[PDB]
Amino acid sequence: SAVPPTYADLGKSARDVFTKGYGFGLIKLDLKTKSENGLEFTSSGSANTETTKVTGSLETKYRWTEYGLTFTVKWNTDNTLGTEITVEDQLARGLKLTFDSSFSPNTGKKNAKIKTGYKREHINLGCDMDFDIAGPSIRGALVLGYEGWLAGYQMNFETAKSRVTQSNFAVGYKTDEFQLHTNVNDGTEFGGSIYQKVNKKLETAVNLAWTAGNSNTRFGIAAKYQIDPDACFSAKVNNSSLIGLGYTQTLKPGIKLTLSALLDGKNVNAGGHKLGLGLEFQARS
């Protein structure tokens, strides 16, 4: 009930359902090797079912959410390198410290962030210090809770220019099991999510994106339907008329078989339908 958000972590759960998957088109072969230390090395190799391309990945997870010391490492062929060190529950209520490191191709663009989100019932204060050449930039989110309301203030302080431009107003209204999360970006483009705990097996999230103008709202409905402990169905329908069907089958034997299909109702007759397959195998059989 404390529900301490933070602009980036506003409705993290709804954001999480939307984030997993989302955007397919490639049949991906994933091989998992369990480290004893806790490194968790899972490499992958995939291709595009339309272009015949070949793209892989390097997933390396050190530790886990055990004592809140999850140091995630994501490396890819495109040269993107990402390391996220998170320390949760540092004080006792809700204290999260995420030092981040993202090195991308862009002339060796180094992204170093320090997020400190202190929580205390209805009150969440996050301080993201981005040590970049354009930075140090200070991006924090101050959220206050009330009679079922979450309001947030995101202040971006570009120290190099010493300008406060980037600011995000979070506004939320609560409904039984359901949360309404929206954010005004620079007084120009709105965007957020809707956390909907439908039932024990159904966790869905609706994304609402609109643009201050007379234009429409692009919104999606993502439903994660856990079927049984070994199977789950993910679907997401945007308002531009794009329905996605993603069936995931987790086998006790340790085998994951996922099918994906994004059909554009405005282009079902034009195509451009994402076709992807996820084949992840647990260790050698």
Protein described:
It catalyses: chloride(in) = chloride(out); K(+)(in) = K(+)(out); ATP(in) = ATP(out); Ca(2+)(in) = Ca(2+)(out). There is a cross-link at residues 12, 20, 53, 61, 109-110, 161, 266, 274 (Glycyl lysine isopeptide (Lys-Gly) (interchain with G-Cter in ubiquitin)). It is built from one helix and 19 strands. The chain has 285 residues and is mainly β. It has one helix at 12-19; strands at 26-33, 41-48, 54-63, 69-75, 81-88, 94-104, 109-120, 123-130, 137-146, 149-158, 163-175, 178-185, 189-197, 202-211, 218-228, 231-238, 242-251, 255-264, 274-282. Helices cover 3% and strands 63% of the residues.
How large is the count of helical segments? 1
- The CATH architecture assignment turns out to be Beta Barrel
Tell me the distance between the termini. 45 Å
Shape field: globular
Please tally the β strands and state the result. 19
Assigned CATH class: Mainly Beta
List keywords for this structure.
285 residues; Porin; 19-stranded mixed barrel; 19 strands; 3% helix; 63% strand
Structure described in brief:
The chain has one helix at residues 12-19; strands at 26-33, 41-48, 54-63, 69-75, 81-88, 94-104, 109-120, 123-130, 137-146, 149-158, 163-175, 178-185, 189-197, 202-211, 218-228, 231-238, 242-251, 255-264, 274-282.
